[PDB]
Amino acid sequence: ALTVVGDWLGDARENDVFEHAGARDVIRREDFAKTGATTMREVLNRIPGVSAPENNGTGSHDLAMNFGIRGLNPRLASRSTVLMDGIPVPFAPYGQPQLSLAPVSLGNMDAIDVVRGGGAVRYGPQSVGGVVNFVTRAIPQDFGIEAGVEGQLSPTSSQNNPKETHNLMVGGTADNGFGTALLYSGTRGSDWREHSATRIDDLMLKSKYAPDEVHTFNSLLQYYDGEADMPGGLSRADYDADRWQSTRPYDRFWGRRKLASLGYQFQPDSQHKFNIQGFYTQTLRSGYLEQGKRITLSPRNYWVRGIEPRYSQIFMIGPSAHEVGVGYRYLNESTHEMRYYTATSSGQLPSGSSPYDRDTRSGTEAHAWYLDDKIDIGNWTITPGMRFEHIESYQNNAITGTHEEVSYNAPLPALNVLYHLTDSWNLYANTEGSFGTVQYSQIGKAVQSGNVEPEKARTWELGTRYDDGALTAEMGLFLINFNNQYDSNQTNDTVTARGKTRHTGLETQARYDLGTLTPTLDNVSIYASYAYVNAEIREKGDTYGNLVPFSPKHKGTLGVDYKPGNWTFNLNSDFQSSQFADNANTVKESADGSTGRIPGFMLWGARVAYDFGPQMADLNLAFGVKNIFDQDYFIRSYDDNNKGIYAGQPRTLYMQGSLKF
Numbered sequence: 001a002l003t004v005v006g007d008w009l010g011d012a013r014e015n016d017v018f019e020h021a022g023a024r025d026v027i028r029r030e031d032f033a034k035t036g037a038t039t040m041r042e043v044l045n046r047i048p049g050v051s052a053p054e055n056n057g058t059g060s061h062d063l064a065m066n067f068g069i070r071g072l073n074p075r076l077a078s079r080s081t082v083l084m085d086g087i088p089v090p091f092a093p094y095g096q097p098q099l100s101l102a103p104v105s106l107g108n109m110d111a112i113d114v115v116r117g118g119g120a121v122r123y124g125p126q127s128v129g130g131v132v133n134f135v136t137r138a139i140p141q142d143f144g145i146e147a148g149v150e151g152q153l154s155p156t157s158s159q160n161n162p163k164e165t166h167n168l169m170v171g172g173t174a175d176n177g178f179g180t181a182l183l184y185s186g187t188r189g190s191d192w193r194e195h196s197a198t199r200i201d202d203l204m205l206k207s208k209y210a211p212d213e214v215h216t217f218n219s220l221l222q223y224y225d226g227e228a229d230m231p232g233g234l235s236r237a238d239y240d241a242d243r244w245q246s247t248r249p250y251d252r253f254w255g256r257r258k259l260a261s262l263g264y265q266f267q268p269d270s271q272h273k274f275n276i277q278g279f280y281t282q283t284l285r286s287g288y289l290e291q292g293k294r295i296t297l298s299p300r301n302y303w304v305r306g307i308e309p310r311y312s313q314i315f316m317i318g319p320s321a322h323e324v325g326v327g328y329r330y331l332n333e334s335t336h337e338m339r340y341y342t343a344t345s346s347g348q349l350p351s352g353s354s355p356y357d358r359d360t361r362s363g364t365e366a367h368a369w370y371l372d373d374k375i376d377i378g379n380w381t382i383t384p385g386m387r388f389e390h391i392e393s394y395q396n397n398a399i400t401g402t403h404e405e406v407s408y409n410a411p412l413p414a415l416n417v418l419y420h421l422t423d424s425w426n427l428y429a430n431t432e433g434s435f436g437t438v439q440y441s442q443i444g445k446a447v448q449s450g451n452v453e454p455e456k457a458r459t460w461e462l463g464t465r466y467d468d469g470a471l472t473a474e475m476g477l478f479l480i481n482f483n484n485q486y487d488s489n490q491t492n493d494t495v496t497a498r499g500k501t502r503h504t505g506l507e508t509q510a511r512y513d514l515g516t517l518t519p520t521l522d523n524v525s526i527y528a529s530y531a532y533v534n535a536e537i538r539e540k541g542d543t544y545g546n547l548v549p550f551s552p553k554h555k556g557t558l559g560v561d562y563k564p565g566n567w568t569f570n571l572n573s574d575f576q577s578s579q580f581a582d583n584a585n586t587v588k589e590s591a592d593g594s595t596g597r598i599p600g601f602m603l604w605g606a607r608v609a610y611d612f613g614p615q616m617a618d619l620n621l622a623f624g625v626k627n628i629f630d631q632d633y634f635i636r637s638y639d640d641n642n643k644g645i646y647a648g649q650p651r652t653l654y655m656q657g658s659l660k661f
């Protein structure tokens with residue numbers, strides 16, 4: 001009886017995902033614990049087409065987030081549109097989307113929704129890698145208290161401090177329709193590397209007010225605060241002598257974020273839905289970093305404010321149903337970056353009293369409009385769509401006295417198609433216009449070369465999704481042509497060079513109840529995820545034909561979950577093939593360990609859990625192991641100051657505990 005869907009991202013509803021006309025995968029809170037995951041990257045890695053490397057480089061710590069979709073640069077997760085309840089996670093979404101500080105915590109989430117395709121009309125910028133949305137925990141309908149903790153230790157490491165991650169959820173909704181939940185997640189500890197001591201506190205207050213069935217108010221307040229020493233890379237000599245050690249004693253990172261979001265929804269009936277969301281974030285991200293014969297201090301402050309009204313209405317035009325969606329977003333971001341320094345040869349770290357060699361302020365004003373129409377005709381659901389962004393950015397350098405500006409547009413036409421083969425089998429196809437912005441650090445290059453145009457991509461997908469209850473599976477193909485990237489893929493970046501890469505491949509995953517084969521295998525489920533990704537450099541120049549760095553051609557997971565009675569036994573494997581560390585695709589390792597082929601690996605993990613009388617207090621206990629066979633592997637940071645070899649996580653033991661009242 002015609003019901004407007006409106007926001008198909010939202011809380012990542014199972015049905016919106018199944019009906020999604022493009023590659024989209026969700027992993028819900030229920031499945032976070034099965035592999036001992038406590039971080040965003042550990043869950044993101046179980047998703048096909050997503051590669052989330054272990055901490056390294058600038059992001060050599062837990063406050064940062066590193067991931068790339070389909071072979072796009074994973075460093076600091078800058079090629080996908082990253083959101084939390086639809087709100088921009090980057091402290092500078094447009095001009096500096098690098099998540100050197102990623103103020104989100106797995107502990108505060110009900111799900112992770114990776115929309116690799118079909119979201120380029122409704123979300124931006126940096127939409128080439130699709131959209132990744134972190135869904136915060138729901139406010140309990142009636143009072144609820146949940147708490148959990150996981151402790152980890154790497155026995156073969158010299159690092160004896162453990163890493164502890166905890167989460168707390170307390171909330172409910174009064175009979176008057178007002179509900180709120182306090183969501184707290186914290187991390188304390190070190191990983192398998194020396195000099196990784198970390199503290200993260202992520203406190204959120206989520207509220208909802210629905211005085212009636214027509215008006216609904218929502219809010220999200222967050223105070224995120226953390227600090228972390230950064231292990232950094234080792235030269236090959238140092239790594240062979242002791243791979244746990246750190247030779248970057250001054251490297252440390254810290255930051256804090258304050259966020260306020262307020263939204264309102266007006267739904268008169270089931271065919272019309274108006275939504276307006278407003279937000280403001282303030283972020284400070286800073287840290288010490290050894291650079292040559294100096295140690296620097298880099299405080300960067302950011303302010304982002306946005307307002308986004310959206311409207312959806314569904315009506316019939318003959319036999320076909322048309323759900324028209326229109327939206328607008330005004331976003332303003334402002335920045336201030338400084339860099340103080342001292343000579344390393346001295347004692348003392350740099351401070352506010354040290355001289356400084358950087359003082360810049362940047363900002364962007366962005367107007368985004370979008371219009372789509374989801375047309376249901378017979379077994380078809382066709383959604384033509386169009387996004388248009390007008391972007392104005394500037395960079396003001398207080399030391400050089402330069403003031404540069406760019407004004408540009410991003411027209412992004414799209415068409416996605418869903419075809420219902422059966423009530424449990426869909427087919428989809430699509431094409432979308434995607435884009436990367438002219439980042440603040442590229443404004444100089446953009447004005448100098450005379451060309452100010454966005455980084456443009458055109459994507460195509462074809463795939464199918466299936467779910468008959470005993471078997472869930474999907475398989476899709478994708479093609480991405482990403483042009484005019486301000487970051488050239490040549491060995492030597494020049495003012496006029498523009499990067500150009502092509503990403504093609506196959507993504508798939510499936511889960512099957514073996515109990516359908518024999519009761520001997522009751523409660524035994526087997527699954528696997530896999531993606532073949534071929535990310536190539538197609539920029540004419542000295543790297544034409546080479547492979548994009550940090551993009552394994554093969555990557556996935558396989559596992560078996562066995563749940564007799566109240567027990568849960570998990571077995572899982574993560575595997576990926578090799579990768580290059582640089583655009584030149586150098587095979588042989590450099591002595592400083594920053595470049596050279598990075599071998600693939602296949603790890604195994606397992607866990608045993610027990611849910612004590614689901615009643616009483618829903619106590620869940622678990623003991624698990626990551627990398628059971630202590631398979632050695634490593635990754636490299638190539639370009640950052642803490643470049644080098646980073647040991648991969650060795651055999652790691654963990655215990656989990658959770659309570660629910």
Ligand SMILES: CCCCCCCCCCCC[N+](C)(C)[O-]
Nearest residue numbers: 147148149166167168657658659
């Ligand atoms: C079954 C184990 C239940 C323990 C889960 C406890 C998580 C609550 C952690 C809150 C820690 C707060 N803080 C900042 C004071 O440390």
Ligand SMILES: CCCCCCCCCCCC[N+](C)(C)[O-]
Nearest residue numbers: 168182184201202203223224225
């Ligand atoms: C500058 C470091 C000072 C830390 C400020 C971080 C806020 C602490 C929030 C902890 C919330 C604890 N809890 C369980 C009571 O909600």
Ligand SMILES: CCCCCCCCCCCC[N+](C)(C)[O-]
Nearest residue numbers: 215262263264276277278279307
């Ligand atoms: C910045 C976005 C937050 C918007 C808050 C504005 C709400 C406007 C709607 C008024 C609601 C009126 N009422 C009584 C009928 O519910």
Ligand SMILES: CCCCCCCCCCCC[N+](C)(C)[O-]
Nearest residue numbers: 260261262278279280305306307
């Ligand atoms: C004054 C309360 C501060 C809370 C901010 C709440 C989020 C609403 C966002 C305001 C956006 C304003 N505008 C027009 C400048 O974009």
Ligand SMILES: CCCCCCCCCCCC[N+](C)(C)[O-]
Nearest residue numbers: 276307308309310311328330365
């Ligand atoms: C250049 C700054 C102007 C940005 C402020 C934009 C105000 C948008 C407010 C939402 C209006 C929604 N609508 C459809 C109901 O009119």
Ligand SMILES: CCCCCCCCCCCC[N+](C)(C)[O-]
Nearest residue numbers: 308309310311326327328330367
């Ligand atoms: C119902 C969602 C559509 C929102 C329409 C809201 C109108 C806001 C337009 C103000 C933008 C003005 N301008 C020229 C500066 O971009």
Ligand SMILES: CCCCCCCCCCCC[N+](C)(C)[O-]
Nearest residue numbers: 322371372373384385386413414
């Ligand atoms: C019932 C008609 C209302 C449908 C609105 C359709 C909006 C889709 C617009 C796509 C146009 C794309 N472009 C650039 C190629 O013109």
Ligand SMILES: CCCCCCCCCCCC[N+](C)(C)[O-]
Nearest residue numbers: 384385386410411412413414433
């Ligand atoms: C006044 C023309 C009536 C046709 C309505 C169709 C929307 C116009 C958009 C098509 C323009 C496409 N483009 C890129 C080639 O300019």
Ligand SMILES: CCCCCCCCCCCC[N+](C)(C)[O-]
Nearest residue numbers: 384385413414415431432433458
């Ligand atoms: C009024 C036409 C509406 C069609 C929906 C737009 C489909 C986007 C197709 C763009 C394909 C562009 N090209 C040249 C790169 O192939």
Ligand SMILES: CCCCCCCCCCCC[N+](C)(C)[O-]
Nearest residue numbers: 417418419427428429430462463
């Ligand atoms: C016998 C009448 C039923 C029509 C047969 C249509 C099924 C062919 C599948 C078309 C699905 C196309 N695609 C790529 C857009 O999903």
Ligand SMILES: CCCCCCCCCCCC[N+](C)(C)[O-]
Nearest residue numbers: 460461462477478479481504505
């Ligand atoms: C392995 C790649 C296959 C991906 C599926 C995409 C097929 C759609 C073909 C349209 C692509 C057109 N072209 C020339 C613009 O790339």
Ligand SMILES: CCCCCCCCCCCC[N+](C)(C)[O-]
Nearest residue numbers: 475506507508530531532533534
């Ligand atoms: C145009 C030929 C280049 C294709 C290179 C072939 C490697 C892709 C093969 C992996 C297929 C995996 N599987 C099971 C999901 O089908």
Ligand SMILES: CCCCCCCCCCCC[N+](C)(C)[O-]
Nearest residue numbers: 520521524560561562569570571
């Ligand atoms: C022969 C004993 C009859 C009991 C049937 C139990 C078979 C369960 C075997 C699958 C165990 C999987 N794993 C790795 C999760 O432990």
Ligand SMILES: CCCCCCCCCCCC[N+](C)(C)[O-]
Nearest residue numbers: 564565567569570571606607608
């Ligand atoms: C109700 C008990 C059912 C008896 C089946 C017993 C087989 C337990 C399998 C051990 C799984 C061990 N692990 C960690 C390797 O997965």
Ligand SMILES: CCCCCCCCCCCC[N+](C)(C)[O-]
Nearest residue numbers: 608609610611612620621622623
């Ligand atoms: C005293 C007999 C009661 C039978 C209940 C079976 C004992 C449950 C075992 C808890 C094991 C918990 N875990 C995950 C830490 O291994």
Ligand SMILES: CCCCCCCCCCCC[N+](C)(C)[O-]
Nearest residue numbers: 142143144145146147168659661
């Ligand atoms: C609707 C009935 C709710 C029962 C209230 C039960 C209160 C138990 C709360 C203890 C929370 C303990 N802690 C530290 C682990 O968070």
